TrEMBL record, chains A, D:
Locations listed in the record: Host cytoplasmic vesicle membrane; Host nucleus; Virion
Function: Protease 3C: Major viral protease that mediates proteolytic processing of the polyprotein. Cleaves host EIF5B, contributing to host translation shutoff. Cleaves also host PABPC1, contributing to host translation shutoff.
Lineage start: Viruses, Riboviria, Orthornavirae, Pisuviricota, Pisoniviricetes
Subunit structure, as described in the record: Interacts with protein 3CD. Interacts with capsid protein VP1 and capsid protein VP3 to form heterotrimeric protomers.
Sequence similarity: Belongs to the picornaviruses polyprotein family.
Protein name: Genome polyprotein
UniProtKB/TrEMBL annotation, chain C:
Family listed: Belongs to the picornaviruses polyprotein family.
Quaternary assembly: Interacts with protein 3CD. Interacts with capsid protein VP1 and capsid protein VP3 to form heterotrimeric protomers.
Lineage of source species: Viruses, Riboviria, Orthornavirae, Pisuviricota, Pisoniviricetes
Location of the protein in the cell: Host cytoplasmic vesicle membrane; Host nucleus; Virion
Part of the intact protein present: 75 to 318 of 2193
Protein name: Genome polyprotein
Function per UniProt: Protease 3C: Major viral protease that mediates proteolytic processing of the polyprotein. Cleaves host EIF5B, contributing to host translation shutoff. Cleaves also host PABPC1, contributing to host translation shutoff.
Disulfide bonds: C2-C180
Domain of life of the native organism: Viruses
Length: 228, 231, 239, 228, 231, 49
């Protein structure tokens, strides 16, 4: 509707609009499930590449800028598929960029001291960690108009943020099915170069391809330029 | 052993709690920053940037979208006839959805301040004529005709003298609620043909205007909320 | 920037001159001036090469004809000049590259023509196909001198509204008034020196928001000449 | 491969290379398992000599130096063989060098006050402790070109760091099978005399013997001195 | 009883958290330190130390490895013919794997700085001759022949005058990633026979050169990671 | 509510940890000391005998 009543006669706080508060708040970026046995769990481990272009809502927000630098905070919510918590010991290993990722439920990859791991019981309150600005360049960039050497067009490897190796501790397999929600919160934000906002459904994580057969108009349509 | 008691809240994870998690890599030194032009500090810096208004948002336009960025004026039009109209509803569906501003509102709940709509004539440098830009305040009645609109806040625009002109909406306010309705206090804008479109022999009998808007320094916003712009 | 009623000038640089009208209405990208890269350990044991020879002059690209149905054009930097003059062999034989730009856009039309050209610069101008997966070709991703034509100017061939491109260093050309634009562009990267061949720091766009119109019998194609001038262009050899 | 793209034009922080950060980070040095009954558990206790030359990765890093001094930190991760945690009470006793080690599941050795023990439930978060520089000499040494009195050649007893006696509390045996991972982290590091890095597979914990039948070349080989 | 609330993270063991565990032996006084020469404070102190490059890494050499530490030059070689070549890829497989530096890179991810390669002639004090050491920058084309290499950065080495000579690689960079590939920006080195090898009657017609490298004071490294040098 | 996180070690009893247990009898005043000859401060005092 449009109830033209109750007019706000007081200016609002500029803090609200500040990039800091715009890109604050923890948010779900990934959901991993390690049930006992079915399709992809006769293993007992998971390798999750820290991916931000996971949920379009977050992504479209970032894409508003060309280059962005920031620290991140991760929190691990874990419980069985039905919300129940059991006394199961877990291990989350952080595999830094350009570092060997577990391939087996017991790869030596899990013992490497340089790959920092965090231990926590399922009953323990959520595990929290802060992962810095791993990029080799002065800032992350959502766009790279060049080539890093074509199928590898626009791919910038200077953005790789690392991987998270989850799994249950113990020689044997875990008797429980797990499903953990990964929350991420950007700290210390800085953005440069503001660019036009997305106006076409996203079709790929790596590029800005759009369904050219169906190009949608940014604003709804009406009958006449005067019907209002 | 310092005597302490755990109070309510202990062990909870509040997706909006500002604390410090441990450093995953304490021995690491992040690639130091450098200088890069165009740093942004507050979204408003962007909202003060004029963007194109899709005033010609006609269902007939959806297949040839470019057309929606501008609207036409011709000789055929008689003096005093309405050219176009649209309310100043940034956060609401319509023309504004194409502007950087209209968009960034969807990411917030409340907001208020002044806006400035600009009109730029692009016809041939040989044509003349006047248009009557008129603002109809919130709760006001929409101009009946060219004369009843001349008595309200307006601006006679001789595009034969200025190829561009700016209007300023004094104030608007939105207080978003659900039930979905907008406590949007906004006015309307009307373009009237003060005089007929004049052109000599050799010049196009149909010209175009591009409309652009943006917030003014007193425009603000509060309460974030993920938009309904994507799927 | 440049329009009717401005004292005509004659800017000369090197072995080249352009008769452009002096109009103190130039666009300065992100409020910055093109300067000489701040000390970085790489150019500490390998000082940067700054050819002021035949690299600092006025490059004029082959004019483009503008017809009633033209959809737009674009150029990638530094790709555009990579194949042109010493700016090419210099940018090629030298690993790293860094430079700012004076970008001049100019129409030539009668006072009986009408049209509106938007002229903006866009850092990291990546493009996307119509799709299934398929990264754009190499001929449209890095067009070089000739440039490429826009197919879907409404989304800028990148799924993003044209209606919002003014959030970038833009400049309007409204025949009815001015007839030429000018833009100062400072180097923009996540590192001081990048690769002059692989990466294109930004793209130049010239889109006709308001189509070109005239009454048959008048020149049907309007020329759009673009002149480019490098500012404080350095190169790292690493040898 | 060798993608000669993206050149790093900024010097990195010298802190990284600092011996402190090189030899930091906790790491798995031992894994003990005390299942209920099978081969070596009809007992119910374990004696682990604090051994650093356990994992070649750590060892090869140290061997880079001749003498080294440092404090250590130990953390005990315990759970059943399958990752499950039960309310089982544990006792870890630190048997200092030149001190009587448990020989039975109930040796008086477990009661000796001078052998500091730490108690903790299996549900309790991991137990952590710091064990100093126990050496009688000014520093530990990975090499001793002499004799400590030949089968005892190169053996330096001034390096003995102590033993850890693990076991479950209670007169009776524990109903649960345990498997605890021992992490160790060197604090306050100081190194002297840097020596050539290892280039032959390790064959013994106590010495630098190498398979002389198969001596491996430090760097891969190629066809011609010009094929590159 | 001080009011406190346990925040997320409570009870976790982060293999990289820098805290204080209790002292297992509080009454103990560690054997006090003494002074010992050759203390090391930063690995770089070691990387600036030249070590032998195995430039003669031939499959044919693996059974008589010593041979890999040096390469030969003889009269048979004609003037202008290539003697040897190898890129400056410290952290990467090849000749450098024998140097203290080449090794310590494997224990890190990124790195960059200047390197200096030295060449020491060992033939008899009666021989003369010149060699053309040439550096081919990153992304550059490998010398076609002695003349095309003389136009690039080089150094004519008359070992009849100096039994040793040093070249300096200006800069190199490695940014390690997986997919395993190296964003290694490195140049190549070529040794050309400027003049034929000259010797009088009584002196060996085949001499040897030993190559040695090391980082210069501006070489650095970051991000540790256990090597793949052992098994 | 002061934000705190329990680090490894929490709940352990280290037979060699020097802490303070609560006073079982806070209102009690121990029989004050007096002077007695032959006080010993360090075993070595005895080893020199």
């Amino acid at each position: 509707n449009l109830i033209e009543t109750r007019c706000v006669l007081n200016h609002h706080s500029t803090q609200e609009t500040a990039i800091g508060n715009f890109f604050s708040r923890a948010g779900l970026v990934s959901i991993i499930t390690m049930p006992t046995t079915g399709t992809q769990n006769t293993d007992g481990y998971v390798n999750w590449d820290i991916d931000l272009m996971g949920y379009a809502q977050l992504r479209r927000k970032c894409e508003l800028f060309t280059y962005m630098r920031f620290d991140a905070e991760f929190t691990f919510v874990v419980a069985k598929p039905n919300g129940e918590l059991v006394p199961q010991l877990l291990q989350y290993m952080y595999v830094p960029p350009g570092a060997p990722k577990p391939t087996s439920r017991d790869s030596f990859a899990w013992q490497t001291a340089t790959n920092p791991s965090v231990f926590v019981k399922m009953t323990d309150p959520p595990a929290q960690v802060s992962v810095p600005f791993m990029s080799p360049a002065s800032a992350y960039q959502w766009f790279y108009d060049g080539y890093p050497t074509d199928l590898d067009y626009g791919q910038c490897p200077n953005n790789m943020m690392g991987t998270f190796s989850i799994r249950t501790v113990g020689i044997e397999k875990s008797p429980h099915s797990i499903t953990l929600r990964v929350y991420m919160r950007i700290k210390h934000v800085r953005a440069w170069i503001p660019r036009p906002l997305r106006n076409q459904p996203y079709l790929f994580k790596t590029n800005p391809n759009y369904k050219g057969n169906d190009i949608k108009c940014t604003s709804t349509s009406r009958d006449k330029i005067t019907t209002l | 052993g310092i005597p302490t008691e755990l109070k309510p809240g202990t062990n909870q994870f509040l997706t909006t709690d500002d604390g410090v998690s441990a450093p995953i890599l304490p021995g690491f030194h992040p690639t130091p920053p450098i200088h890069i032009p165009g740093e942004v500090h507050n979204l408003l810096e962007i909202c003060r940037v004029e963007t194109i208004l899709e005033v010609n948002n006609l269902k007939t336009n959806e297949t040839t979208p470019m057309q929606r960025l501008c609207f036409p004026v011709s000789v055929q039009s008689k003096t005093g006839e309405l050219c176009a109209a649209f309310r100043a509803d940034p956060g609401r569906d319509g023309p504004w959805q194409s502007t950087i501003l209209g968009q960034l509102c969807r990411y917030y709940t409340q907001w208020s301040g002044s806006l400035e709509v600009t009109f730029m004539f692009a016809g041939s440098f040989m044509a003349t004529g006047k248009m009557l830009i008129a603002y109809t305040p919130p709760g006001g009645n929409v101009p009946a005709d060219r004369i009843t609109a001349m008595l309200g806040t307006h601006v006679i625009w001789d595009f034969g003298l200025q190829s561009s002109v700016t209007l300023v909406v004094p104030w608007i306010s939105n207080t978003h609620y659900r039930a979905y309705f907008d406590y949007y206090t906004t006015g309307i804008i009307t373009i009237w043909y003060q005089t007929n479109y004049v052109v000599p022999i050799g010049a196009p009998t149909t010209a175009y205007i591009v409309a652009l808007a943006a917030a003014q320094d007193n425009f603000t916003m509060k309460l974030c909320k993920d938009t309904e712009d994507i799927e | 920037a440049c329009g009717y009623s401005d004292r005509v000038a004659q800017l000369t640089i090197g072995n080249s001159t352009i008769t452009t009208q002096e109009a103190a209405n130039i666009v300065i990208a992100y409020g910055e001036w093109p300067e000489y890269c701040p000390d970085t350990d790489a150019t500490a044991v390998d000082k940067p090469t700054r050819p002021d020879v035949s690299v600092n002059r006025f490059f004029t690209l082959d004019t483009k004809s503008w017809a009633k149905d033209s959809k737009g054009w674009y150029w990638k930097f530094p790709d555009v000049l990579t194949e042109v003059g010493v700016f090419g062999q210099n940018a090629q034989f030298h690993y790293l590259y860094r430079s700012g730009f004076c970008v001049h856009v100019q129409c030539n039309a009668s006072k009986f023509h009408q049209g509106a050209l938007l002229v903006a610069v866009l850092p990291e101008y990546v493009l996307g196909t119509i799709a299934e997966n398929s990264h754009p070709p190499y001929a449209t991703t890095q067009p070089g001198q000739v440039g490429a034509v826009l197919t879907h100017p409404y989304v800028l061939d990148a799924g993003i509204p044209l209606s919002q491109l003014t959030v970038c260093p833009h400049q309007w050309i409204n025949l009815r008034t001015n007839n030429c634009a000018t833009i100062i562009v400072p180097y923009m990267n996540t590192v001081p020196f990048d690769s002059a061949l692989n990466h294109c720091n930004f793209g130049l766009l010239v889109i006709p928001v308001v189509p070109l119109d005239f009454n048959t019998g008048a020149t049907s194609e309007i020329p759009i000449t673009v002149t480019i001038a490098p500012m404080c262009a350095e190169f790292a050899g690493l040898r």
